[PDB]
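Cross-posted from the bioinformatics board.
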Amino acid sequence: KKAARLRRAKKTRAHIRFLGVYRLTVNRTPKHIYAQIISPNGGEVIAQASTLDGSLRSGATGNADAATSVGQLIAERAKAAGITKVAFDRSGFKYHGRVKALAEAARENGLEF
Amino acid sequence: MLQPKRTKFRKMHKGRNTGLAHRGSTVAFGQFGLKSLTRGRMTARQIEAARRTITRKIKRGGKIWIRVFPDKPISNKPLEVRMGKGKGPVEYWVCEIKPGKMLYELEGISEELAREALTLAAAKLPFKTTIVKRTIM
Amino acid sequence: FALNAVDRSAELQGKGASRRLRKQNLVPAIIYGGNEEPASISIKINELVKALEFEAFFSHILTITVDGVEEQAVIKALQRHPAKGFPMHADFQRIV
Amino acid sequence: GSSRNGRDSNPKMLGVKIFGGQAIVAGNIIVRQRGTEFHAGAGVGMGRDHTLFALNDGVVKFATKGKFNRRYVMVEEA
Amino acid sequence: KTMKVTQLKSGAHRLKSHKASLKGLGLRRINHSVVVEDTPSTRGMVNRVNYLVKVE
RNA sequence: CGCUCAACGGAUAAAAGGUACUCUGGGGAUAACAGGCUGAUACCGCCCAAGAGUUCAUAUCGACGGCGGUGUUUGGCACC
RNA sequence: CCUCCUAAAGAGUAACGGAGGAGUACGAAGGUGCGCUCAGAACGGUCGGAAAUCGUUCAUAGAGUAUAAAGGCAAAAGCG
RNA sequence: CGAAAGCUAUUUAGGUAGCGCCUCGGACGAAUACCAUUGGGGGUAGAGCACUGUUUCGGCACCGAUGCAAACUCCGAAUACCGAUGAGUAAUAUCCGGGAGACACACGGCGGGUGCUAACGUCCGUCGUGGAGAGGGAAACAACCCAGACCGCCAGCUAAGGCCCCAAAUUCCUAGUUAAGUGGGAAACGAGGUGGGAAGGCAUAGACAGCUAGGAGGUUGGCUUAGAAGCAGCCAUCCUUUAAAGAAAGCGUAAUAGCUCACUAGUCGAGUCGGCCUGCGCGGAAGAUGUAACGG
RNA sequence: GCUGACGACCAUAGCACGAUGGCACCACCUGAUCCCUUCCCGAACUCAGAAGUGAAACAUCGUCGCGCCAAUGGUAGUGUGGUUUCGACCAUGUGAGAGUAGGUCAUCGUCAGCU
């Protein structure tokens, strides 16, 4: 349930807002996975990568490989946008499976968190 | 002898009685209304006596409404006791009264008989009273 | 179902001015609703008392003549003295 | 009749210590309270007794924010 | 512009703030007239002690 | 680490009473007598009238209630 | 010593003033990571009822918070 | 120049000590006070049942009306307090050191607890005065009002309070009220005192009062009661002749009887009747040395 | 024009009722081999997928039934000075609560996708 998922994501969201660092928020669906970097103010999106990107749109989305790819592309985009230190936000999803692969790809491809 | 069945606190402060009776100045339940022009304290014994006189006069021909209830307790000290050493107990209960407050209302009876009964009740009560006709607005 | 009123100026408004007006034997009243802005008026207390005596006065269309302009209204609220009982304020609503 | 109740506790000196628009330095106690009558926003930290204190220099600001309409205390860099 | 302020009544027994208002006005004694520039602060002082002062 | 040093800023490690056989330094800073203030209580009077009075409230008495006067009992204060 | 009122909307504020508690407990009842949401009401269901446990619908807390009360508590400070 | 009778602690309560309050020297110099604008938090006055209780009525614990609460609050000021900016005025504020005194306070307001919203009672907060302060007023009267005395003048202006005499100043002016020496003590309540105000009922188709005549029949309405006949009490209060008359507003009877009244007709002729509000008055109103409750 | 993520604000943003939405997206949905789950249960969580449906949920649209917001005027209280019969009143400054007229089916920001 999205209501419960947001209910269990708010603790991490609030702690990261208190920390005042750029936040790498993930949002995954049975079909697609999205990652975007929000500013410490929490209302600006400075980098994004999803499986809606033309590079991996016509492909096997909703997959661990797709999450790994999205992590690699958002890592490159953050490097090009000047972000090097973020706080990961699984957004209530368990740190596992597609979210975990996304995080590992981003962490190995330039971002350190 | 009107009295609350139970109270949260046995003793209550003396308080201060001031201001006009903005609430309870309009007659609702009954056609005939008796109001108080002067502020004061109304004892349960006073309420009982006025009720009894009004009931005797009506002789079961009209309906009586009591707008006053002695929720507030009053503490009195016994004789041959020095000041202090604790507050006294609630000998009797009184109802705070402000000018214009409704005391009693009557319905279902002739105006003249209601006026006579209200005169008797006013004679018993410690408040100056003027009979007031009920008004829609 | 008609009554005569007088414009209540901004210097006749407020607590002290209202008490002075009632000492000059005028009852403050406000006509609002309808379409236009509220208008503040004063009604002679004897005339208002006599009008309040009649009972349909509280349920029919009233006509307020403010020394000139005319207003069809309906008495909405009446503030009386809690003890003395005399009228203290009047609230009328324009009828469209 | 003896109703023996003549006890009371010592004062605790709670309440707001620094009000809105006042200059404040890091470490100043802003509010002494029981529970979160006031909450800590940006620039204010929260102690074990619910004390609100300035985490950094600036000006104290009071606001009502969020869904629960809570009262919040912040330190703006100004 | 300037205004003339005079002290009609004694200020000794007035409240501390009213006494300070008289000091700010500059009136040290009854039936003493002083000259002050006309500004809302001075008018507020004269308003605070209005009952015991008059303005020409 | 060892105190119900609880009279809890803890006087000693170690402590109750009688005095009409009494005594000294002070207090009207504080009690008993009287005076003073007050008037709860008390006494007296008045208002209403359920009633009693064979009938009939008010010849006489006045339940439930209300309002005063006196200083006049039992009280409160501690001003001399 | 602690909580509420007295306490007159900053703090503080007395009475032999009105009301209640304390002289503890826990190696988890602390820390962290994760997860969860209570009291009641009605309906259905073996023993089984006013009320045991099970299922369903409402339910911002009408519960819980080791303990007196005040404040607070959803990122729950409550429950695993 | 100039306090305090306060907090805290005390084998402490009428002592003492730290702080607060006074003085002197030094440092410093607007960092202090007032006022204008302006940034803040509140849970008091008020108000109200949305929580905790409590209360009345009606409908059927819940709904609709209706009140109350220091330990209730869905609300909620004015002040006060903490800050910022800015004028003017001011013998400011802060710090170090030498010397104290004081830690019995009192009355009058205002917000309270206690008491009896009793005490020249007792305990707090807060303002003024005395304490430690004369002077003028309140007859006398620390605490109330005006006002703060450096000394001297046989000068003038005023504050509070006053102007007929004691006793300084108006037997001053205008418009009204009181007949009680009210003024110059005292309430519930009672009354046909008097003035005024907003409206009403009746009236030359004769208003109110007075006087003359009538004021009736069914019927002793039914019940109850020993009795109950208009008039102990309960339930109706209907009809008829009418110009009018009540199944009666009083007196009266054991119950009847009887006398009235309301009401109608006649006489009389012009204003009259009863409620409400407001100002000033009256009774209620009795104590002890002597008028003795305007100082005279 | 619509959908999704994150925010501003925290009811004039809610509740309730009715309607539209499946090309993208979202949600249901298929299966439990694998990763990972249950003090039992693939409910949730997790994984691998599109046979089916917008039924539920979600989003958008409409309303005034509830809720919420809310005047003007008046009243209450109240600082200062004065008066007082202690209830209050006068001058000045301030000014509620309740109730009434009325208003409301939000307004915006960044990024991505289909059109």
